[model samples]
Target chain A: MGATAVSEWTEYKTADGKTFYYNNRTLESTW
Target chain B: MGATAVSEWTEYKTADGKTFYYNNRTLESTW
Candidate 1:
């Protein structure tokens, strides 16, 4: 299969269990 | 509680089922 197409938006879970979402294409320090 | 102290960081769930994070103070766009 070709390189997996990534979603425009996505998420992450912090060590403390908090969730965050950011644009895969334009990540920043806070993101 | 006396105006519950908010966290510097926080998250929200979108209607489309996506989750996003933001700082309570700044409230910038796209986590």
Candidate 2:
């Protein structure tokens, strides 16, 4: 795919205490 | 938070077949 790119993977804390990570490129989240 | 609930972590594929995971509890996505 031309000009295909992926976003940076980062961690985030939800309103709760749990933490999760996500990547905009794929728009996926993991616990 | 009282009565607070977290969603389960699940996997999904975008229109392009891009695999991603998410948890309803956090409403987070990761690639």
Candidate 3:
């Protein structure tokens, strides 16, 4: 088989049960 | 990554079935 590819737009969950986009690297576009 | 985001987290499949990480304008990390 092959590696599981990630989607173009993904949302990572934090240990605190929070959700963010772009991993919160830049709190700019919250799209 | 900061972590704490949400998305479908689907596999980014290319037109030719080439699977890869096509992050949404950026990439997300799983905390």
Candidate 4:
């Protein structure tokens, strides 16, 4: 339990035809 | 015809208890 687990980036199609990045652990996202 | 469409980042677990990033569209990954 020293460092938190970080996940890699993945792609997903949005309902609005837009895409963004989503962190499974942190739940952070980038568009 | 400007920029290539990019995808968001998603998380996935490996068979060895490891995690990595996956781009659904570009198929790029980070660990």
Estimate every model's Cα lDDT from 0 to 1.
0.31, 0.31, 0.32, 0.33
Q: Mind giving the per-residue lDDT tens digits that candidate 1 earns over B1-31?
A: 1111212222433443235544222222222
Q: Against the true structure, whose TM-score is highest?
A: 4
| Shift of residue B8 alpha carbon in model 3, Å | 4.6
lDDT of 2: 0.31
- Which stretches of candidate 2 lie above 4 Å from their native place? A15-31, B1-31
Tens-place lDDT per residue, model 4, A1-31, is 0222244464433434332333323321222
Give the worst 10-residue stretch by lDDT in candidate 2 chain A: A1-10
TM-score for every candidate vs. truth? 0.16, 0.19, 0.16, 0.21
User: Candidate 3: deviation at residue A12, Å?
Assistant: 18
Residue B27 displacement in candidate 1 (angstroms): 21
Q: Measured by TM-score, how close is model 2 to the native structure?
A: 0.19
What is the docking quality class of candidate 4? Answer: incorrect
Q: In candidate 2, residue B2 scores what lDDT?
A: 18
* Candidate 3 residue spans exceeding 4 A from truth: A1-31, B1-5, B8-13, B22-31
Model 2, chain B only, scores a TM-score of 0.20
Per-residue alpha-carbon lDDT of model 2 for A1-31, expressed as tens digits? 1122233323433344333334333322342
**Clash totals for all models, in order?**
0, 6, 9, 10
Please state the CAPRI-style docking class of candidate 3: incorrect
Flag the better candidate by lDDT, 3 or 4: 4
RMSD of 2: 18.1
Candidate 1: list runs displaced more than 4 Å.
Answer: A1-6, A9-11, A19-31, B1-31
Model 2 Cα lDDT, one tens digit per residue, B1-31: 1122232343432333233444322233322
Error of 4 at B14 (Å): 2.4
Scored against the native two-chain complex, candidate 1 gets a DockQ of 0.05
